[PDB]
Amino acid sequence: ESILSRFDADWTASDEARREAKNDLFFSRVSQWDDWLSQYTTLQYRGQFDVVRPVVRKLVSEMRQNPIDVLYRPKDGARPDAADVLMGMYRTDMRHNTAKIAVNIAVREQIEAGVGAWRLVTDYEDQSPTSNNQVIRREPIHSACSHVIWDSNSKLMDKSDARHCTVIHSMSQNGWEDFAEKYDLDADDIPSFQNPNDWVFPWLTQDTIQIAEFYEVVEKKETAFIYQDPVTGEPVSYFKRDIKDVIDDLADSGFIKIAERQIKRRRVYKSIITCTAVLKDKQLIAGEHIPIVPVFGEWGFVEDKEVYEGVVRLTKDGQRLRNMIMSFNADIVARTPKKKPFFWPEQIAGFEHMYDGNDDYPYYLLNRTDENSGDLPTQPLAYYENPEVPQANAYMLEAATSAVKEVATLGVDTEAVNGGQVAFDTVNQLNMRADLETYVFQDNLATAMRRDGEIYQSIVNDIYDVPRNVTITLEDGSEKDVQLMAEVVDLATGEKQVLNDIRGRYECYTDVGPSFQSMKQQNRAEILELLGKTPQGTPEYQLLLLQYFTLLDGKGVEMMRDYANKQLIQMGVKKPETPEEQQWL
Amino acid sequence: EWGFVEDKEVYEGVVRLTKDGQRLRNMIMSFNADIVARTPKKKPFFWPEQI
């Protein structure tokens, strides 16, 4: 019926699989264990080979330039009044390094095993509910070969669409784990799947009961500005729009509606899982967003199914033939086991006493006795053995050897310019950009001290009812400018749950890109290319302030800030913050 | 790239080289492949006078 839907959308997976289900194992079949099916009447000693790894390991050393510590952003709309506590914008993991290390085997690996992943905090865990930014991290999903594949059009980065609603990872007897945090269920959803064991079950694990989770179906929401034919019976109700100039003002012909996002009832029916049944009811997740970004790779392709192998397919050909070198001998080593010369020896068969090792020469009774017509030998000499001193393998294996080293190739050069950064590390900065919906988009945690003028304080706006006259500062007193004062203040509206299309805030997070932007940047890149390009002058050394001065240590960062420049300002400051500074008598 | 005798367009690449450079190396497998994987009784063959 029409219940099926996404099944076909998912079944094309098994239709796109064909042999990639079998041939995506092959990626590590060359890096792991045996020579598999091809050989007919295969030989002994089985499975230790290796020799592959360094290419897909040591070049990951080229991926470690990453750290890129960044803070303290310029722009207009963003007010750096709260910049003191704003530090949560830059790094959510700032209280642990384990998040930086956790890239581990997952993220670096697009070939040897499955790709990496990333998870932000599932909203509002009760841990540490105090102030702005609290995040830590978890493992990126296990490889699980190809049978975990993420496909709709296999194009977009980070959704903005409802697809790969499938979220699955394998488990064990205890692997059910934390899902019991509310209902406890039966612990068993019990879907039944079919995996390629090749039907005879030759091996150990008979386990069953494959379980998963989903979100919703196609999850399409359009704001959908609204006008329709009034009197004609109007079935199907309202459509949705692209270009507005036609429809601007109907006020003469049109009605007065004032309707904004009214649906509040069902649209698409898949429920959740299966061909033959479905069960669950009343499942919704918090507020609905998608700041969870599984990482993707990039290569342009030819046809149909989504496949891009690793960078190195070259391991097979040259490396077969070394095992061939040891094979042609290791088979015949028992067939040339250091054996006997002949025929003037009369030893033939003899007494058993003689296998004690024979360190005395005379041995046993040699004779020339034979029977024939006359004396002449027929070749009892030349044949013993002969080597062929293997020949053709010389430059065939020099070309195999010089070949299989092509896997190591990235940007062969000397030094300095024409960077050796990896094509896989240049799609890592779009993983810095992975999340589309961050923005300032939703602000609930972390935003400020108060919300909507602390939802009390705007009462000052009503205090305009006061008679007589409003005046400016007098009766100074000793307190004066100390912080946290409210008497004469002008503020209107409010701020909560961000705003509708209104600036005054902006995303402080990532400009990541080329090396342009400098706060103090290349000063900790020191002399690696030349050295300081700005000599000095008599007034001009007072402008070197921006060059050197950096960070941290203790509170000994004082450095002329609080004394010299106050009564008169000779050299200025970089972006004076100074809520209030100078007092005058 | 664009230009041609007719109006047909096959883009002009730098990778068009394949040809006989590689293929004879691919033909060499006719030499070895049948005399290695097969078992053509290569031995120190002597003294089967009869049977």
Do A166 and A212 form a contact (C-beta atoms < 8 A)? yes
For residue A79, give every residue at least 6 positions away whose Cβ sits within 8 Å of its Cβ, in sequence order, or none: A504, A505
For residue A311, give every residue at least 6 positions away whose Cβ sits within 8 Å of its Cβ, in sequence order, or none: A111, A407
- Side chain identity at residue A178, one-letter code: D
In chain B, which residue's Cα lies nearest the Cα of A385?
Answer: B44
- Whole-angstrom distance, CA of residue A462 vs CA of residue A227: 40
- Whole-angstrom distance, CA of residue A521 vs CA of residue A568: 31
Nearest Cα to Cα of residue A267 among A213, A235, A214, A220:
A220
- Whole-angstrom distance, CA of residue A227 vs CA of residue A250: 9
User: B44 vs chain A: nearest CA distance in angstroms?
Assistant: 7
User: B37 vs chain A: nearest CA distance in angstroms?
Assistant: 9
Chain B residues inside the 8 Å CB shell of A39: 37
3-state secondary structure of A213: strand
In chain A, which residue's Cα lies nearest the Cα of B42?
Answer: A332
> Cα A490 vs. chain centroid, distance in angstroms?
47
Torsion of CA A482, A483, A485, A489, to 10 degrees: 110
3-state secondary structure of A45: coil
Judged by a CB distance cut-off of 8 A, whether residue A335 touches chain B is yes
Paired tokens of A250: 């109907």
Paired tokens of A172: 């064990």
- Whole-angstrom distance, CA of residue A523 vs CA of residue A500: 41
- Whole-angstrom distance, CA of residue A273 vs CA of residue A279: 8
> Which candidate in B25, B27, B35 is best for mutational testing of the A interface (most A CBs within 10 A)?
B25
Nearest Cα to Cα of residue A314 among A403, A231, A386:
A403
Give counts: helices (H), strands (E), chain A: 11, 0
Nearest Cα to Cα of residue A392 among B37, B41, B33, B43:
B33
> Cα A119 vs. chain centroid, distance in angstroms?
10
Chain B residues inside the 8 Å CB shell of A336: 44
| Residue given tokens 């975990």 in the structure block | A148
- Side chain identity at residue A58, one-letter code: K
Judged by a CB distance cut-off of 8 A, whether residue A334 touches chain B is no
3-state secondary structure of A167: strand
- Whole-angstrom distance, CA of residue A433 vs CA of residue A296: 12
In chain B, which residue's Cα lies nearest the Cα of A395?
Answer: B25
Do A435 and A158 form a contact (C-beta atoms < 8 A)? yes
Do A442 and A289 form a contact (C-beta atoms < 8 A)? yes
- The DSSP H or E segment spanning A229 is none
Q: Which of B31, B32, B44 sits opposite A385 (nearest CB)?
A: B44
3-state secondary structure of B4: coil
The total number of residues written for chain B in this structure? 51
Do A80 and A577 form a contact (C-beta atoms < 8 A)? yes
Chain A residues inside the 8 Å CB shell of B40: none
Do A534 and A544 form a contact (C-beta atoms < 8 A)? yes
Q: Inspect the interface and report whether the beta carbons of B44 and A324 lie closer than 8 Å.
A: no
Torsion A295-A105-A141-A299 (CA) sign:
positive
Nearest Cα to Cα of residue B33 among A434, A209, A396:
A396
Nearest Cα to Cα of residue A585 among A446, A480, A473, A430:
A480
In chain A, which residue's Cα lies nearest the Cα of B32?
Answer: A392
Torsions phi, psi of A167, nearest 5? -135, 115
- Whole-angstrom distance, CA of residue A353 vs CA of residue A376: 35
For residue A240, give every residue at least 6 positions away whose Cβ sits within 8 Å of its Cβ, in sequence order, or none: A222, A224, A225
> Which candidate in B31, B32, B35 is best for mutational testing of the A interface (most A CBs within 10 A)?
B32
The total number of residues written for chain A in this structure? 585
Do A512 and A433 form a contact (C-beta atoms < 8 A)? yes
Judged by a CB distance cut-off of 8 A, whether residue A396 touches chain B is yes
Q: Inspect the interface and report whether the beta carbons of B28 and A328 lie closer than 8 Å.
A: no
Judged by a CB distance cut-off of 8 A, whether residue B43 touches chain A is yes
Paired tokens of A117: 């992943």
User: A324 vs chain B: nearest CA distance in angstroms?
Assistant: 9
3-state secondary structure of A46: coil
In chain A, which residue's Cα lies nearest the Cα of B46?
Answer: A383
| Residue given tokens 């020799």 in the structure block | A51
Strand partners, A469: none
User: A552 vs chain B: nearest CA distance in angstroms?
Assistant: 54
Chain A residues inside the 8 Å CB shell of B41: none
Chain A residues inside the 8 Å CB shell of B46: 383
Chain B residues inside the 8 Å CB shell of A324: 36
Paired tokens of A287: 């507020």
- Whole-angstrom distance, CA of residue A283 vs CA of residue A215: 9
3-state secondary structure of A62: helix
Do A350 and A364 form a contact (C-beta atoms < 8 A)? yes
- Whole-angstrom distance, CA of residue A415 vs CA of residue A417: 7
Per-residue DSSP letter, A59: G
Q: Inspect the interface and report whether the beta carbons of B44 and A399 lie closer than 8 Å.
A: no
Q: Which of B31, B32, B46 sits opposite A383 (nearest CB)?
A: B46
Q: Alpha carbon of A198 to those of A40, A194, A201, A202, A364: distances in Å?
A: 19, 11, 7, 9, 63
Q: How many CA atoms lie within 13 A of A399 on its CB side?
A: 10
For residue A286, give every residue at least 6 positions away whose Cβ sits within 8 Å of its Cβ, in sequence order, or none: A123, A124
For residue A34, give every residue at least 6 positions away whose Cβ sits within 8 Å of its Cβ, in sequence order, or none: A46, A47
Do A424 and A63 form a contact (C-beta atoms < 8 A)? yes
Nearest Cα to Cα of residue A66 among A416, A551, A431:
A431
Do A78 and A508 form a contact (C-beta atoms < 8 A)? yes
Longest dimension (CA), chain B: 76
Chain A residues inside the 8 Å CB shell of B43: 335
Judged by a CB distance cut-off of 8 A, whether residue A328 touches chain B is yes
What value does the CA radius of gyration of chain A take, rounded to a whole number of Å? 39
Nearest Cα to Cα of residue A115 among A144, A138, A90, A154:
A144
Three-state secondary structure string covering A285-323? CCCCCCCCCCCCCCCCCCCCCCCCCCCCCCHHHHHHHHH
- Whole-angstrom distance, CA of residue A553 vs CA of residue B47: 91
| DSSP H helices in A63-158 | 98-101, 104-107
Strands (E), A459-575: none
Judged by a CB distance cut-off of 8 A, whether residue A392 touches chain B is yes
3-state secondary structure of A584: coil
Do A102 and A139 form a contact (C-beta atoms < 8 A)? yes
Tally of CB atoms within 10 A around A410: 12
Q: What is the resolution of this structure in A?
A: 3.3
Angle between helices A393-404 and A315-332 (to 10 degrees): 140
> Which candidate in A35, A340, A395, A396 is best for mutational testing of the B interface (most B CBs within 10 A)?
A396
Q: Is A272 left (phi over 0), alpha (psi -120 to 50) or beta?
A: alpha
Q: Alpha carbon of A450 to those of A377, A570, A578: distances in Å?
A: 115, 38, 22
| Residue given tokens 């002597």 in the structure block | B46
Angle between helices B19-27 and B29-36 (to 10 degrees): 20
Burial level of A59, CB count in 10 A (0-12/13-18/19+)? buried
- Whole-angstrom distance, CA of residue B22 vs CA of residue A317: 14
Three-state secondary structure string covering A358-426? CCCCCCCCCCCCCCCCCCCCCCCCCCCCCCCCCCCHHHHHHHHHHHHHHHHCCCCCCCCCCCCCCHHHH
| Residue given tokens 């998963």 in the structure block | A212
Q: Inspect the interface and report whether the beta carbons of B36 and A324 lie closer than 8 Å.
A: yes
Judged by a CB distance cut-off of 8 A, whether residue B45 touches chain A is no
Do A138 and A119 form a contact (C-beta atoms < 8 A)? yes
- Whole-angstrom distance, CA of residue A519 vs CA of residue A412: 33
Burial level of A1, CB count in 10 A (0-12/13-18/19+)? exposed
User: B33 vs chain A: nearest CA distance in angstroms?
Assistant: 11
Give counts: helices (H), strands (E), chain B: 2, 0
Chain A residues inside the 8 Å CB shell of B24: none
User: B13 vs chain A: nearest CA distance in angstroms?
Assistant: 17
Q: How many CA atoms lie within 13 A of A389 on its CB side?
A: 0
For residue A136, give every residue at least 6 positions away whose Cβ sits within 8 Å of its Cβ, in sequence order, or none: A93, A95, A96, A98, A99, A121
3-state secondary structure of A60: helix
Q: Is A218 left (phi over 0), alpha (psi -120 to 50) or beta?
A: left
- Whole-angstrom distance, CA of residue A1 vs CA of residue A496: 46
Judged by a CB distance cut-off of 8 A, whether residue B38 touches chain A is no
Nearest Cα to Cα of residue A299 among A176, A499, A471, A155:
A155
- Whole-angstrom distance, CA of residue A327 vs CA of residue B14: 41
Nearest Cα to Cα of residue A21 among A190, A198, A172:
A198
Q: Alpha carbon of A489 to those of A57, A81, A427, A466, A478: distances in Å?
A: 62, 17, 49, 14, 21
- Whole-angstrom distance, CA of residue A345 vs CA of residue A332: 27
Do A418 and A411 form a contact (C-beta atoms < 8 A)? yes
User: How are the residues of chain A apportioned to helix, strand and coil, as percentages rounded to the nearest 5?
Assistant: 20, 0, 80
Q: Alpha carbon of A258 to those of A226, A227, A262, A263, A465: distances in Å?
A: 9, 11, 11, 14, 34
How was this entry determined?
X-ray
Per-residue DSSP letter, B48: -
Torsions phi, psi of A11, nearest 5? -70, -25
Q: Inspect the interface and report whether the beta carbons of A392 and B37 lie closer than 8 Å.
A: no
3-state secondary structure of A324: helix
